[PDB]
A paper describes a structure:
Latency associated nuclear antigen ([name]) is a 130 kDa multifunctional protein required for TR-dependent DNA replication and episome maintenance during latency. [name] binds to two adjacent sites in the 800 bp GC-rich terminal repeats, referred to as [name] binding site 1 (LBS1) and LBS2. In this capacity, [name] acts to form a site-specific origin of replication and as a molecular tether between the viral episome and the host chromosome.
To characterize the structural properties of LANADBD, we crystallized a construct encompassing residues 1011–1153 and determined its X-ray crystal structure at 2.05 Å resolution. Three helices, which contain the key residues involved in DNA binding, flank this core region. The surface opposite to the DNA binding face of LANADBD is a dense basic patch composed mostly of lysine residues. Consistent with this, the angle between dimers in the decameric ring is approximately 110°.
Author numbering:
A (entry chain C), E (entry chain G), F (entry chain H), G (entry chain B): 1013 to 1147
B (entry chain D): 1013 to 1148
C (entry chain E): 1012 to 1148
D (entry chain F): 1013 to 1149
H (entry chain A), J (entry chain J): 1010 to 1147
I (entry chain I): 1012 to 1149
The structure:
Amino acid sequence: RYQQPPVPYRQIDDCPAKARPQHIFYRRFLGKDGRRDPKCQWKFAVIFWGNDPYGLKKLSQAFQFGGVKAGPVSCLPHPGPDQSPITYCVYVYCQNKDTSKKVQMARLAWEASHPLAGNLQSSIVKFKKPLPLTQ
Amino acid sequence: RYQQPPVPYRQIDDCPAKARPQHIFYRRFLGKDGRRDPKCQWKFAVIFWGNDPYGLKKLSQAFQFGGVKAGPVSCLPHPGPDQSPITYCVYVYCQNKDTSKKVQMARLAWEASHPLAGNLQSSIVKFKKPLPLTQP
Amino acid sequence: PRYQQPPVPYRQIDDCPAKARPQHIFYRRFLGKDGRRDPKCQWKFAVIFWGNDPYGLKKLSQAFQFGGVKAGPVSCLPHPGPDQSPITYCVYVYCQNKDTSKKVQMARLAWEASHPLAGNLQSSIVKFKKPLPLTQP
Amino acid sequence: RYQQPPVPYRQIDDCPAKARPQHIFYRRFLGKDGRRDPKCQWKFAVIFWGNDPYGLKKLSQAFQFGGVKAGPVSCLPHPGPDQSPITYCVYVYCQNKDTSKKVQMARLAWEASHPLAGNLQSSIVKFKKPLPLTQPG
Amino acid sequence: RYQQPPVPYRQIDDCPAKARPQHIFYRRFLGKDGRRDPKCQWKFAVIFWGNDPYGLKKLSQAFQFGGVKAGPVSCLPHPGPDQSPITYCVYVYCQNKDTSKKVQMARLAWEASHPLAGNLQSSIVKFKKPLPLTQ
Amino acid sequence: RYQQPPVPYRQIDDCPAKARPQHIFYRRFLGKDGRRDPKCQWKFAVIFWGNDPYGLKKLSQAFQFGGVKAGPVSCLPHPGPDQSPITYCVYVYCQNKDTSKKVQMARLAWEASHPLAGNLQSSIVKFKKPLPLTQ
Amino acid sequence: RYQQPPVPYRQIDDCPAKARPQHIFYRRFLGKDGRRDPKCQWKFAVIFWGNDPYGLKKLSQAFQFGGVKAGPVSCLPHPGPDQSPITYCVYVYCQNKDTSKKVQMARLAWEASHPLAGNLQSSIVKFKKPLPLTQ
Amino acid sequence: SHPRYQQPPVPYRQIDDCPAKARPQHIFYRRFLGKDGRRDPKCQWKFAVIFWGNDPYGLKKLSQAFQFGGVKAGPVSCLPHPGPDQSPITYCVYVYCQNKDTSKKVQMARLAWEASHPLAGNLQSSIVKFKKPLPLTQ
Amino acid sequence: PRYQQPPVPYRQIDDCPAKARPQHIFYRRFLGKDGRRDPKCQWKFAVIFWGNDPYGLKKLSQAFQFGGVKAGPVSCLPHPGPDQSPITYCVYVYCQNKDTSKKVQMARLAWEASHPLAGNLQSSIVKFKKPLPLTQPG
Amino acid sequence: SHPRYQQPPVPYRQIDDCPAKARPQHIFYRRFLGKDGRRDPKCQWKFAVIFWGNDPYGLKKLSQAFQFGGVKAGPVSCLPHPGPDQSPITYCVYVYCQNKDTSKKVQMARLAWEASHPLAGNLQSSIVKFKKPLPLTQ
Ligand SMILES: [Cl-]
Ligand SMILES: [Cl-]
Ligand SMILES: [Cl-]
Ligand SMILES: [Cl-]
Ligand SMILES: [Cl-]
Ligand SMILES: [Cl-]
Ligand SMILES: [Cl-]
Ligand SMILES: [Cl-]
Ligand SMILES: [Cl-]
Ligand SMILES: [Cl-]
Ligand SMILES: [Cl-]
Ligand SMILES: [Cl-]
Ligand SMILES: [Cl-]
Ligand SMILES: [Cl-]
Ligand SMILES: [Cl-]
Ligand SMILES: [Cl-]
Ligand SMILES: [Cl-]
Ligand SMILES: [Cl-]
Ligand SMILES: [Cl-]
Ligand SMILES: [Cl-]
Ligand SMILES: [Cl-]
Ligand SMILES: [Cl-]
Ligand SMILES: [Cl-]
């Protein structure tokens, strides 16, 4: 009835098909930084936003790892008193600032290599209290 | 799948009636901190989370003001390899840290006065770069 | 009896006078654990509330009665100028830490938000250099 | 029914007679610090406390100046769940920390010079927000 | 014609009569700041100065305590090349900055309660090395 | 009767004879630091003390300059509740800390070239408020 | 006879053909960071190294920008007294440490998008004095 | 080794193996460095000195001269063109070391060679530091 | 042999050259304990005195010979110009701390004030980065 | 020049003026110091390097060599005896200059010379700072 989180996967063939190439690149580029850091807490993310929801879905399905986990496609609120064109967003959660920076670079690399991909705005995010993403 | 953002409000007549009481309380309680301070950028939020999406949807509909704006009901990722019970969440965006604390306090106040309402966990949130929430 | 006396304490919710009781109930729930006394703490904080209606202040005094949050009686600020002008009544709500003090302040703000007939009180956190005699033996 | 603030004075003769010696000494001792200065906000006080309401009342009536102004005799709450003997208090409001320390010293001087006067405890007090003791405007 | 220091007392009966009222006020007002703190060094004072040596003398005789001890009535030198009206001074020696300040306060108090009394100018004084006033 | 301050003098002929030698030395050694400086307040001194009042009187009489001015011979209070043997002192006022150190050194120099004469203990002194010694 | 630097080039057609894909990617991923900053000194680089000189040549030819400039394919010294197999290296010169890190990521990303590319070791480099790369 | 690409200087055991025209410079350095020229096994290869200028032969002799246990020159290389066209080349040689102090002695040593041989070119230079160690270890 | 020698050391006032002995006696008393060696400190300070009269400087040099305060011989500062101009003599008085160095300056200033025939010497405190070899061989 | 006292080294304007046994050292320093060897006319004389050792003749060549517009050695002087008895003399030469950078370069120049010449004495030295400027302008 309501939004639902991306379903997780260990095997690359579980990743939806059209996000698969983005997923693979992310796995190779993130490397060890993609792995759950047992030590740290989940107090970081990167928020990506732009106008195309389908682009963001792929990004959300591509960013699913031990230490890097995206939520579903969401929205920013309308900016003004009235309705305007929607800005969608995905939060890519992770454990430390450095991983969060690498997530940003990762997507920017994907964009660089795919001129037809949306150029997403982004920001590093930090949470005062830890999020419940432990196993 | 694809969410839309809560509709904004002209008059309280435009707030969904199930959230109207929560909304009116927040309007009075936030007072001036609920008004848009164009002097500021949008670099803060509060994230509320819990297991009950209806609770969160009323919260979301309730927090719709000039300087305090909720996103729709959303989700955190599954924490592990397999699927666990869903943790829903709502981000309430605002323009400064003081307001983000007032937002947490508003919700605690509502909860105190309504022992049946869900006791939501939350966290203050800070963004490095400002969000596109300025008025056109 | 020419002098003020301190508010009486409660052994149960129903000992709070009825007109102030709902406000007291909301405070008990909202303050929660922080309403409780911390016998390892000293008393060097308060929130002063002030306004024009002494009966409103009396209910706020009656409502703020807990182990770690205790209102004095309805009192007054001095006149600001050379002649008697409208009275600003005030109540001090004594607390054990700054945190609880801001919570006290928020509690009343919530109360007012949820009850429009309630007076819109002004307030300020207050800090004492020395500990007040509010400890037990 | 409700407490009232001390009446403010235009001339020494308007001061209640029993408090008038204390008022004159404070007027002379405080000197310039007893006057209002328009450069400052009302964010300080001295709280005096003891078991003697009449002694406090003279103190309260004595400290009525442009820049130093006492509240009425009030009470601190009971320390415990049971009533205990009343501790009375007076807040003497000032515009700055130095004036607040001078007020404590003033009263210590008064005690030193009058062995029959009670020995009051006190604390300096700081308010995060300014109190409404300025004139309208 | 050499100056001598004022006489010390043990009893209040030992204070010269004309200085006794001021002495008893100071004894009461200074309280325990008035008494000697043996683990402390004498590196402070209050200098009082004005035009009336008689008022200063009583002040001198008044401030005689374990931790607060006045020297005799003395003088500032002349301010200019020629002789001008004499400015008398008395140093009241203390062991800390707090007591100094209280000494200033003590005498202001005395002045507020006696309009006839001289309104003496004063300064806190600090000595880099300790004075020989330990017993 | 009460103490008076040393008589100021500008010509070395107006200096009391017993102190002329000291004075001539201090005049040359203090050099420019002996001169008054209007852009400075009078918030410093050196206090000299010891058991011999005549020694201190010469010093008092010697240190009379534009920017360096001694009070008369005075005393410190007795250290205890019984009368002790007197410690005398003289304050030499001046405008800055540097000059006060110079004044100290000047007297040590004098002690060094007159080894038979008595030694004085000293301390640099600082006043919170400026003393009334401008013209 | 002596080594020569890579050809600089304005438009992509002047880029050697084999380096053009890597150059385009870099041009897009570096973004503004690829541009010169005349108010910045050349005191950074990334040194890339590996055993395939042809791989290094393409990287060398690809990193030719206003603010990011590669030297030619060079060598590290033999590490021992005997000749062993050669470790080639290319220095990619930059005007700040952030650009350096970005150059490093740019190649990692290239390696993540082409599993056939060699996997170059690399290091940020810091120069005490500025190199003569000013316009 | 690949014929289309630079090779590193041949390393050498006795002084006689140094290329004839480098040898004096080499002997001079060997004396000036003393024991600083030896492999310091407690240290990682994280430093160099870069020498640069416009005469490649001058740099080639320096390159050939600086081959010791703990200081190893790469071959004559180049900086990239500073601008949009080919312009006069600046050649360079990196002389690798294990620590800052050895890197300063290399720099000093060359300064000495120049002050004592006025035909030698006056090479610009800089200390260089690497975040990760280079593969110059045993 | 034919180079400058330091002042001959003497720890008995009568062994001080007679012409410097009054200046010596005054310095010994005025420096007091500051005049003694403190093994705990190192020799990283001095006062340089200079002037055009080498004899006045010679007496100063002879006068300042103490355990913790020790003058070198009368020396010179270089010619300022490309050509020779009238000589500026100097004496370094070595000390173990800054306080003692200022005292040394005050000492000579005192001597000048009490002896108007004495030259007025300019001086400067001096600080050395590294310790001079003035510790006792032990 | 009073014959009882030291005098400053003779200044040059041309290298044939340099005492022959110091000429090698002199030229080497002129080249090593380069620009830093000349008078920096926006600066006062408040630095030096003191060199010391037991061989006065080596120090004398050093004194003679360090003569430039911005680096100027005094004569061979010495330190005081360290103890209350005559012991072996430690000779010293101050090499004056206008800023701390020049003084570090002076120090390095000598060091580079020594590293280059196994027969040269290994002189100890220290940088030196004067609180007031020395009269080396005129
Ligand atoms: Cl960001
Ligand atoms: Cl975890
Ligand atoms: Cl939080
Ligand atoms: Cl109320
Ligand atoms: Cl009440
Ligand atoms: Cl209501
Ligand atoms: Cl407040
Ligand atoms: Cl009244
Ligand atoms: Cl009383
Ligand atoms: Cl207090
Ligand atoms: Cl003062
Ligand atoms: Cl004497
Ligand atoms: Cl002192
Ligand atoms: Cl003046
Ligand atoms: Cl690195
Ligand atoms: Cl540039
Ligand atoms: Cl060459
Ligand atoms: Cl460098
Ligand atoms: Cl002679
Ligand atoms: Cl010795
Ligand atoms: Cl003489
Ligand atoms: Cl100096
Ligand atoms: Cl050094």
